[PDB]
Amino acid sequence: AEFRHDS
Amino acid sequence: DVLMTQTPLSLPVNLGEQASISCRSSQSIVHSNGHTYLEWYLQRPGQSPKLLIYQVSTRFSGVPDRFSGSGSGTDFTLRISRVEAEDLGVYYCFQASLVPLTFGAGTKLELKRADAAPTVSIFPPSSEQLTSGGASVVCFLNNFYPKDINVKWKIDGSERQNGVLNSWTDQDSKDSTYSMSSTLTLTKDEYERHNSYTCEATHKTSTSPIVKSFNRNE
Amino acid sequence: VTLKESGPGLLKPSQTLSLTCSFSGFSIRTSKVGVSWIRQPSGKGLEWLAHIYWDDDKRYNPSLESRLTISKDTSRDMVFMKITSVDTADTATYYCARRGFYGRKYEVNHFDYWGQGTTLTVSSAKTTAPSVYPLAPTGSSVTLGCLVKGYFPEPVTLTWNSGSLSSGVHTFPAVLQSDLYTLSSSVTVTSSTWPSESITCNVAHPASSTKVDKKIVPR
């Protein structure tokens, strides 16, 4: 599962 | 999970030479957002890790241009163009695209020197220890290079793998060598049952293992 | 920007570890940086444990997740970690690392600042004085040693002839085994030096207020 990265 | 495989794990270098560390991920670490969260960190001896490179090839602020990262997908390389003393330490690649975030095992960039044979010494239990009911046999392997070495204990010709405590010094700050200490701890009762005690060292500087032994009754 | 970890130093197996990371030079609230805990177990590399985002969303390393709880207090500018049921293998340095970013580009983030870390040793042992044993052995030099066995906690101090003998000494890092530390040191001198002159291992273990001077004497 991907790590969250905000935009 | 994403396994991060660094090669080599040990990288002796002469100052002023170039160096290269490969990092392979077990699957693509391209994130769905379009970035590849591949980072290089350096941990200098006795210091906290610090950021060198992020997004594969962008140098962090204050990191000099002799460092360069390249690669894509799973295939990543850190190059250092002219190694300085400040560059020595443990290099980790790191992926922050998939959970768990994972580090490589670490690549130890160290100061190279010529090979050197260990000087090996073996020590019977002290009288004081024996009187307390214990019996430790100590073997010192001093001033060798490179760090890779195999130490084997035998008692009356039979290898003992259990009851062993090993420790290694950091690379000497003057002569660049390593040393090791190995302690085999038995009871007094066990010690008094056996005769011959042997510390055997296999190192690249000898075509045969370096053997030091004694007999309990000498 | 500074990060400062705090933790108990020593714990017994089964206790809960509570760590704190405190930030200076900026505001967790305003910056919205994510924060992770990473550890370095004895003799190993780095291992990521947990991460907390500005809105209290969290991610964990599955290998330890069941034992981990990360949290934050924006009013105090602090991030916390709890690790339940500590055992020997939790003996490590614990780092706080800020996932800072370039400008307002939240997506261009990375661990830009790390604390000095906090070291934890997990052991059942109460304060224990070492036993200190002399290691005595034809040729031009002789190598002697000193075995400092079964103490807790760190550190011990070891010198040879009250610090006057320094050349040819190797003092080995302590190792924790079965809840107690062992350390050792070797010294090499010319055969004309010993046993004609005394050579003594001076060992102090401040936690137990023990000071022992062990002369190395021939067998």
Three-state SS sequence of B62-77: CCCCCEEEEEECCEEE
With the C-alpha atoms ordered C26, C31, C32, C34, is the resulting torsion angle positive or negative?
negative
Q: Which of C11, C13, C33 is nearest to C23 (CA)?
A: C33
Write the DSSP assignment of B68-118 as a string of letters. EEEEETTEEEEEESS--GGG-EEEEEEE-SBSSPEE---EEEEE----BPP
In sequence order, what are the residues at sequence separation of 6 or more whose Cβ sits closer than 8 angstroms to the Cβ of residue B199?
Answer: B120, B122, B137, B139, B151, B152, B153, B182, B211, B212, B213
CB < 8 Å from B in window 83-102 of C: 95, 97
Same domain for C131 and C148? Answer: yes
Identify whether the C-beta of residue B152 lies closer than 8 Å to the C-beta of residue B210: no
Same domain, C189 and C90: no
Q: How far is residue C88's CA from residue C117's CA, in Å, rounded to a whole number?
A: 18
Which residues, 6 or more positions from C125, have their beta carbon under 8 angstroms from its beta carbon? C152, C153, C179, C180
Please tell me the distance from the alpha carbon of residue C174 to that of residue C164, in angstroms, as a whole number: 22
CATH superfamily, domain at B115-214: Immunoglobulins (2.60.40.10)
Name the domain count of chain C: 2
Q: State chain B's maximal CA–CA distance in angstroms.
A: 73
How deeply is C43 buried, as exposed, middle or buried, from its count of CB atoms within 10 A (0-12, 13-18, 19+)?
A: exposed
Distance CA B51, CA B88 (A): 14
- Compute the half-sphere exposure of residue C51: CA atoms within 13 Å on the CB side of its CA: 24
Cα separation, C27 vs C112, in Å, equals: 15
Chain breaks in chain C (C to N over 2.5 A) after: 137
Same domain, C93 and C135: no
- The DSSP result for chain C, as a single string, is -EEEEE--SEE-TTPPEEEEEEEESS-HHHH--EEEEEEEETT---EEEEEE-TTS-EEE-TTTGGGEEEEEETTTTEEEEEE-S--GGG-EEEEEEEEEESTT-TTSEEEEEE---EEEEE-SPPPBPPEEEEE----SEEEEEEEEEEEBSS--EEEEGGGT--TTEEEEEEEEETTEEEEEEEEEEETTTTTTS--EEEEEEGGGTEEEEEE----
Deposited experimental method: X-ray
Domain limits at C177?
A: 125-218
Peptide bond between residue C62 and the one before it cis (omega within 30 degrees of 0): no
C-alpha span between B83 and B65 (Å, rounded): 12
Closest to B50 measured CA to CA, from A3, C68, C1: C1
Task: Point out the domain boundary residue: C100, C124, C148.
Answer: C124
Are residues C16 and C101 both part of a single domain? yes
* CATH fold match for the domains B1-113 and B115-214: yes
The three-point CA angle C216-B131-B179 to 5° equals 45
Q: How many CB atoms lie within 10 A of CB B13?
A: 16
User: What's the N-to-C CA distance of chain B in angstroms?
Assistant: 56
The verdict on A7 touching C (C-beta cutoff 8 Å) is yes
Please report the resolution in angstroms: 1.6
- Identify the domain boundary among C124, C151, C176: C124
Q: Are residues C175 and C150 in the same domain?
A: yes
Instruction: Flag whether residue C136 sits within 8 Å of chain B, measured between CB atoms.
Output: yes
Positive or negative, the CA dihedral B47, B49, B51, B56 is: positive
Could you tell me the two tokens for B138?
Answer: 């100590």
In the chain, the amino acid numbered B127 is S
Residue B199 CA to residue B153 CA, distance in Å, equals: 5
Mark yes or no for CB contact C53/A4 under 8 Å.
yes
Residue C7: Cβ within 10 Å count:
18
B107-111/B10-13 β-pairing: parallel
| Selection from C127, C125, C147 nearest residue C136 by Cα | C147
- Sequence-separated contacts (24+) of B26-32 with Cβ below 8 Å: B26/B1, B26/B2, B26/B74, B27/B2, B27/B74, B27/B98, B28/B73, B28/B74, B29/B2, B29/B73, B29/B74, B29/B95, B29/B97, B29/B98, B30/B72, B30/B73, B30/B97, B31/A2, B31/A3, B31/A5, B31/B97, B32/A2
**Torsion angles phi and psi, residue C28, rounded to 5:** -60, -50
Beta bridge partners of C114: C97
User: By C-alpha distance, which of B43, B212, B24 is closest to B119?
Assistant: B212
CA distance C64 to chain A (A): 16
Last residue of a domain, one of C124, C149, C183: C124
Q: Supply B192's token pair.
A: 């008094």
Taking CB atoms and an 8 Å cutoff, what residues of chain B touch A3? 31, 37, 96-99, 101
Same domain for C134 and C205, yes or no, is yes
Any idea which residue has 């042992």 for tokens?
A: C125
Both C87 and C129 in a single domain?
no
**The dihedral sign for the CA sequence C163, C166, C169, C172:** positive
Q: How far out from the chain centre does Cα B89 lie?
A: 11
Residues C106 and C22 in one domain: yes
Breaks (C-N over 2.5 A) in chain A follow: none
Comparing CA positions, the residue from B7, B2, B6 lying closest to residue B31 is B2
Strand C118-122 with C92-101, pairing: antiparallel
User: Does one domain contain both C60 and C134?
Assistant: no
Q: How many CB atoms lie within 10 A of CB C219?
A: 11
Cis ω for the linkage preceding C206 (within 30 of 0):
no
Breaks (C–N over 2.5 Å) after residues, chain B: none
CB neighbours of B177 closer than 8 A, spacing ≥ 6? Answer: B113, B116, B142, B143, B144, B145, B171
Report the residue of C33, C49, C56, C59 to disrupt the A interface, i.e. the one with the largest count of A CBs within 10 Å: C59
Identify which of B137, B122, B121, B120 has the alpha carbon closest to the alpha carbon of residue B192. B137
Conformation bin of residue C10: beta by default, left when phi > 0, alpha when psi is -120 to 50: beta
> For residues C170 and C132, what is the distance between their CA atoms, to the nearest angstrom?
16
Identify the H or E element spanning B192.
helix B188-193
Q: Where are the domains of chain B?
A: 1-113, 115-214
**Structure token digits, residue C27:** 């505001």
- Count of CB atoms situated within 10 Å of the CB of C55: 10
- Is residue C149 within 8 Å of residue C212, measured between CB atoms? no
Which residues lie below 8 Å from residue B174, measured CB to CB, with a gap of 6+?
A: none
H helix or E strand, kind and range, residue B50 = strand B50-54
Rounded to 5 degrees, what are φ and ψ at B99?
A: -95, 130
Rg (CA), chain A: 6
Contact assignment for A5 to C59 by CB distance below 8 Å: no
Contact B132 C131 (CB under 8 A): yes
Helix (H, G, I), strand (E, B) or coil at B162: coil
| Phi, psi values for residue B191, rounded to 5° | -55, -45
Burial of B5 (0-12, 13-18, 19+ CB in 10 A): middle
Q: Domain B1-113 belongs to what topology? A: Immunoglobulin-like (2.60.40)
Cα dihedral sign for C42, C47, C53, C56? Answer: negative
* C131 in the same domain as C109: no
CATH code for position C140: 2.60.40.10
